Write a sequence for this structure.
DNA sequence: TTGACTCTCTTAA
DNA sequence: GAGAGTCA
DNA sequence: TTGACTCTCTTAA
DNA sequence: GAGAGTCA
């Protein structure tokens, strides 16, 4: 809601509720052949999810509170960042999972960044493999690696140079 | 169905036409602070584009040939790969620009890979910066770097551990 | 047979 | 990665 | 007021 | 990153 006090209240109620989600240990690649452990606070798979939470998509949730007798609703991972700018360089800020685990609502696993920055973490070599993200990755991105390219650059004739 | 000879003739006519596209010299980051040069064969900004070519979107084109009274049409960057498998690991193969220049139709700047592999090249450190793509990048990805994250992981209380 | 437009679609964050 | 509506 | 569903949308490859 | 229709 409009007031800073009301926004802090939303963040605090969200943190209390999410803090009661099951804590699931995930062992993750860090890059550089190293492994670490993350503690994700995972929203339940089915209703009930927790006070204020409802599922709007297979892996999409929303947080809802009644303030000033009106319903205020946010994407469930956006709540930690309600006091932050909602854009950067003209690009919309998104909640971005450092653990790449959409059910996780641990704010220590979330950052607030452009969708491009968000996506790019999928391929990051990780905090022990050369991550250069200013807000550092918690793990190597799940899509990091050589890829599975079927065909490389090629020509039949002699019309082209690299 | 088109024979492999007919497909080869399509690829040859496409190469002949694209080989007359304006060749533009671009200086690009390779990673590791090194700069290099790519030579892109750029489809024109407006019609006419070249024999067989037509624009179906802001940065989308198609190549069309009529063979024995039947009209055949392909995505304009897919033609080099018509003799290749069209899927891998259950994922559709996509034309993927190693030069990240959609107007370019230089087949020496294209590969054929999943959309995930394609996207991930946007953040690659580049052939002189640590690229691990089996079909190596030609340049550092345009989105490589520290990013512009607005807010990092944070909590107000003590409900969470990382 | 061809050019130059038109429209909607896929994927996974 | 999002916002918003329909019910009970 | 709160819960549990429904729908479509955004972005840039 | 795609496929397909209309019209002359
Ligand atoms: Mg993400
Ligand atoms: Mg690409
Ligand atoms: Zn997590
Ligand atoms: Zn990183
Ligand atoms: Zn090129
Ligand atoms: Zn690469």
């Amino acid at each position: 809601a409009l007031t800073n006090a009301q926004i802090l209240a939303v963040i605090d109620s969200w943190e209390e509720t999410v803090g009661q989600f099951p804590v699931i240990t995930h062992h993750v690649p860090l890059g550089g052949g190293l492994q670490g452990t993350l503690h994700c606070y995972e929203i339940p798979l089915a209703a009930p999810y927790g006070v204020g939470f409802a599922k709007n998509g297979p892996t999409r949730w929303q947080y809802k509170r009644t303030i000033n007798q009106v319903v205020h609703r946010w994407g469930s991972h956006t709540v930690p960042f309600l006091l932050e700018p909602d854009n950067i360089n003209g690009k919309t800020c998104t909640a971005s999972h450092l653990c790449h685990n959409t059910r996780c609502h641990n704010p220590l696993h979330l950052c607030w960044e452009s969708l491009d920055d968000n996506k790019g973490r999928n391929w990051c070599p990780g905090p022990n493999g050369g991550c250069v993200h200013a807000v550092v990755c918690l793990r190597q991105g799940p899509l990091y690696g050589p890829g599975a390219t079927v065909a490389g650059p090629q020509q039949r004739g002699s019309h082209f140079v690299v």
Q: What stands out?
A: The pocket of zinc ion (ligand 5) is lined by residues B 38, 40, 99, 101, 104, 106, 109 (CB under 6 Å). The two ends of chain B are 58 Å apart (CA to CA). Chain B has one domain: 1-162.
